[PDB]
Amino acid sequence: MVLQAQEIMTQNVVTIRGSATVADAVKLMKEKKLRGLIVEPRHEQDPYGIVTETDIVYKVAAFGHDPKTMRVYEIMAKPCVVVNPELGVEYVARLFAQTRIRRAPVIQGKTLLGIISVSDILFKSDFVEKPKRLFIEDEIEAAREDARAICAAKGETSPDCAAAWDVVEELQAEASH
Amino acid sequence: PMVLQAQEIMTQNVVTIRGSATVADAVKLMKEKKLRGLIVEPRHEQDPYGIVTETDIVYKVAAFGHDPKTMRVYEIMAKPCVVVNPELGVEYVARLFAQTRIRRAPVIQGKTLLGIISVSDILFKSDFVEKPKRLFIEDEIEAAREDARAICAAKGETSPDCAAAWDVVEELQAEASHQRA
Amino acid sequence: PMVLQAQEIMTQNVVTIRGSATVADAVKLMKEKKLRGLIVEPRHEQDPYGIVTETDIVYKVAAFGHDPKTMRVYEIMAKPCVVVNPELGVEYVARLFAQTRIRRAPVIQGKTLLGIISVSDILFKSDFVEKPKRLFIEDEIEAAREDARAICAAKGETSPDCAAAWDVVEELQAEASHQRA
Amino acid sequence: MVLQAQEIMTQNVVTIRGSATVADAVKLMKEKKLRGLIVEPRHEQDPYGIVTETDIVYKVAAFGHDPKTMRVYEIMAKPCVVVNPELGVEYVARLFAQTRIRRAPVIQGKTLLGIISVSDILFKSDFVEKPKRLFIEDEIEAAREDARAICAAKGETSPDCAAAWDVVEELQAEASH
Amino acid sequence: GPMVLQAQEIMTQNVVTIRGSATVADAVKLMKEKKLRGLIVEPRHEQDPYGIVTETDIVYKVAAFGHDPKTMRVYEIMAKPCVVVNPELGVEYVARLFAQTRIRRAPVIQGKTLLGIISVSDILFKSDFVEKPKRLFIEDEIEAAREDARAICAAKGETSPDCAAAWDVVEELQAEASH
Amino acid sequence: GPMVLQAQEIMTQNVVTIRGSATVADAVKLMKEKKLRGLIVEPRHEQDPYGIVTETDIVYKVAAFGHDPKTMRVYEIMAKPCVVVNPELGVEYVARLFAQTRIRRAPVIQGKTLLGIISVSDILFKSDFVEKPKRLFIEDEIEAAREDARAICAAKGETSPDCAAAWDVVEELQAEASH
Ligand SMILES: C[C@@H](O)CN1CCN(CC(=O)O)CCN(CC(=O)O)CCN(CC(=O)O)CC1
Ligand SMILES: C[C@@H](O)CN1CCN(CC(=O)O)CCN(CC(=O)O)CCN(CC(=O)O)CC1
Ligand SMILES: C[C@@H](O)CN1CCN(CC(=O)O)CCN(CC(=O)O)CCN(CC(=O)O)CC1
Ligand SMILES: C[C@@H](O)CN1CCN(CC(=O)O)CCN(CC(=O)O)CCN(CC(=O)O)CC1
Ligand SMILES: [Yb+3]
Ligand SMILES: [Yb+3]
Ligand SMILES: [Yb+3]
Ligand SMILES: [Yb+3]
Ligand SMILES: [Yb+3]
Ligand SMILES: [Yb+3]
Ligand SMILES: [Yb+3]
Ligand SMILES: [Yb+3]
Ligand SMILES: [Yb+3]
Ligand SMILES: [Yb+3]
Ligand SMILES: [Yb+3]
Ligand SMILES: [Yb+3]
Ligand SMILES: [Yb+3]
Ligand SMILES: [Yb+3]
Ligand SMILES: [Yb+3]
Ligand SMILES: [Yb+3]
Ligand SMILES: [Yb+3]
Ligand SMILES: [Yb+3]
Ligand SMILES: [Yb+3]
Ligand SMILES: [Yb+3]
Ligand SMILES: [Yb+3]
Ligand SMILES: [Yb+3]
Ligand SMILES: [Yb+3]
Ligand SMILES: [Yb+3]
Prior knowledge:
Chains A, D: Residues 9-67, 76-134 form the CBS domain. Chains A, D: This is Similar to tr|Q8YYT1|Q8YYT1. Chains A, D: Keywords: CBS domain. Chains A, D: Pfam families: CBS (PF00571), CP12 (PF02672). The structure is a homohexamer. In chain A, strand 4 and strand 5 (111-117) form a beta hairpin. Chain A has helices at residues 5-8, 22-32, 53-61, 89-99, 118-124, 136-154, 159-175; strands at 15-16, 36-39, 49-52, 103-108, 111-117. Chain A is α+β, with helices and mostly antiparallel strands. Chain A has two domains: 1-128, no CATH class; 129-177, no CATH class. Residues 149, 152, 157, 166 of chain C line the site of one copy of the ligand C[C@@H](O)CN1CCN(CC(=O)O)CCN(CC(=O)O)CCN(CC(=O)O)CC1.
């Protein structure tokens, strides 16, 4: 089976109010050893947010702002990009690359189950031993249509026909790990 | 209930396409149905939603002169794509969009596709002209009260600085009701 | 004449607004006329065209919760804005748009505003599905002929490498006509 | 009067074919001492393009590509952003900041008149001695409407009325250099 | 201490290197065994610059496309040259260098010797910025406010309200720069 | 010469500095008199990093908004720390450092001494990349192709077609890296 986000996520996830200071955030991250805090929703409809080590370094430290006067609402992402627990890790990897984030809460319904990061992916993903190309199932469909057309046009016993079907088979082998 | 939600302003006519379709098939569907975005069908329970938009097609195919009859949707779609909760307030959708630099997203609840929401939807149907509320003002109010409580403890409960800090709490609270009205 | 031009696919209904108007006035006009972009009127002969678009309004006003009744168009417009020649081929418009990361621009000839052209206009009305031509293929052909001429001079006019280099010139020239048809 | 692009542009502008090699481009730039070449339109409808020192350094030198095999069409901007000769330099400065370019051809109709750059602006603009805020005329209109409203509401002889008109006057003074 | 905290005082000292010719699988294996979010790429000779490959390079460039780490090589995804950090550089400057260049980690180099590796985590966990916040370029602000003050006093007189005001700006700033 | 051309061989040697506390007008005046597209910002002390302010900083951040250069200061628009260049660094690496960090000019620093200033123009006008083009990290490619070659020969025999093929890859690459 495809390895899922919830199988590699960090389960220790702490939350903080958006009204807290950045100093409060930094203290919590130091005590708990955390590179990201989830911002508590204030009510059922209110979205999840996140504040991360990079937010704090780029937006506070890099200008020399006083973390005791800045607040989490001034530097958090809210709404933040979120991850389904069933989502395959290769998709998380990609969501992360496309949106340029390194971590996200894992949410199922409106319940917070954990937090998943690039480090989680590097350290616990099966991607070295089971690399599987994204959208391969869509590739398989397309390569079958191509193969069917080449064989109709050039003949069932032509080198180009046999080549096109070989593509269908290398892909199907690749999709079954 | 009070804040206008994504589902109240989304476009409900949402069409999907397979990732294996050609870009030409995508363009034909968008022209027939008059659509600036197609949702890519999930292949199974776990598989995420994706999107292909007018800009994907123009920037990745038209601008190079690629043949839409040989490219496929999987070559230019975003998958996973950023998604929007139906309960999310429109001011938050506006912000999600600004932070992620997108102009449209599917509205998804659980794994069910309810619609599609865009910057146009926001411009044409949001209540932001008549009910403007600054984002996180409620968090500002909490912080200004903590600041005020600290300044009064430090400088004395009858000090000009104490009364000033509470006046900031009150200008903010006036601002938060003026618009909750 | 052969290549489909910007003016043949542009939207002709183009409305303008003053830079001094409020964002609320802009939003009202866009809603009445159903428009995703307003052109900002030049104040005099030399003054450039500007644009304010649905995204400017959503990203700069809605996403922060600013009051559109107190902000002004000059605070969120692009001026000068990128402009499009009416004679420009649509594949070039597609590319200008990709390189500059915009989705719409006024079509201007001299200082006269003829219309407005967008990615939607391109998606819905461009001939790129049926007449795909790779950009700068004609420049590729010239370069491949220079390469071919050099390889033949260096390795001999009857050499496999000479005949191969000219075969590249011919596959390209076949590709450039297949679509000029 | 507002200083215009054509008054500060470089008039020595050389062109090159898009089919030329990057080595040809580099040779021409070295002989003529130029940080940008205009790409010749091939016919009346064909847009102007540009290739600049940065294109060459970022796209060829930084990867170690052979300038003798790469071509100008592979690294040029075409269409390129263009400048009207009548456009005020403060607007050129801004067009440049918004589009993140440092140079553009000056075109009137379809005739190439010159080339204008950030250096041209730094060295020949009047911006140190006559800095003029962009869209001030639009600001003036808005400040008059504000002033008219405050005086109607609070009275013609109120401090807030006199303050609002003082804004109208500081702006009008600023717009006349 | 009262001095500005320096990069070398907060850097991670356990720094491992890899050749640019190694596979990404070799890189991933090393990072897993040693528990590391970044490897320094060995310079091949005196002139050759340092490089870096990081957890994000690997996830964004290899995992997210489904490339085979056993066939890709570190030279295909590393930054070389990479941005490098002086050991004497103040952490608030490292924070800024990081923001301006959009990186999250860099080698600490003195001459051509590798001393360690410094990251945003190092900054979050070990910087003194909570207890000693100092605005960037306040020292430059102080110099400018002194030049302004000197000029106003020369022009308007050394005992003038405007002179005393301008020096009061110099003093509020100097108080802000210390503690 | 045959060696890789270094930053110090193509840098501009006329390099002027300015304090961060100076006005942008002072900066503009200096750049006009000396004919310069960039000024180096003086470090205030041993630990303090180098900075830079460039023609683009001034045009994009001051001119384009209509700010008064007589009231703005260099610290409000400079990069500090700025990316810096070793004098021994090869120009193809400078070109790359520039692309990766999105800058067009940098100081050349050896230790804490300022030797000059190097820019994209310097690279365009004085680089040997037309006559000596070398692909970046080809040396790393060569190392990898030798490891591959060594393995194929150990596995399949030293006289096997596959062995001779793998070494032929090593030789085409080595020819490409020279002349
Ligand atoms: C309300 C103010 O008093 C602010 N308060 C800080 C606010 N936060 C979170 C929050 O209460 O929203 C920390 C919660 N904590 C215990 C608790 O209150 O539940 C702190 C106790 N005190 C005083 C008090 O609360 O009685 C410190 C000041
Ligand atoms: C610390 C701040 O609270 C200062 N406080 C002013 C000083 N005092 C009493 C005191 O608080 O020592 C006045 C009494 N009064 C109600 C009350 O305090 O019970 C004030 C109401 N507010 C808000 C609030 O009280 O929460 C104003 C701020
Ligand atoms: C056509 C080929 O011959 C290529 N040609 C290079 C092309 N360019 C520009 C161009 O001609 O499009 C340089 C022009 N120049 C004089 C001229 O031709 O007008 C070169 C002369 N020769 C031979 C020749 O042209 O007769 C060199 C090879
Ligand atoms: C240098 C290349 O031009 C080689 N050339 C092949 C060698 N020879 C003659 C020769 O060119 O020495 C064949 C004669 N023939 C027409 C002619 O050359 O006049 C070829 C047509 N083409 C294109 C072209 O000729 O422009 C093929 C390329
Ligand atoms: Yb079969
Ligand atoms: Yb179906
Ligand atoms: Yb329409
Ligand atoms: Yb690709
Ligand atoms: Yb109180
Ligand atoms: Yb206010
Ligand atoms: Yb009018
Ligand atoms: Yb519509
Ligand atoms: Yb502003
Ligand atoms: Yb010939
Ligand atoms: Yb082909
Ligand atoms: Yb009057
Ligand atoms: Yb860990
Ligand atoms: Yb030595
Ligand atoms: Yb050591
Ligand atoms: Yb650690
Ligand atoms: Yb002064
Ligand atoms: Yb004194
Ligand atoms: Yb010059
Ligand atoms: Yb020393
Ligand atoms: Yb000197
Ligand atoms: Yb020069
Ligand atoms: Yb192998
Ligand atoms: Yb041998």
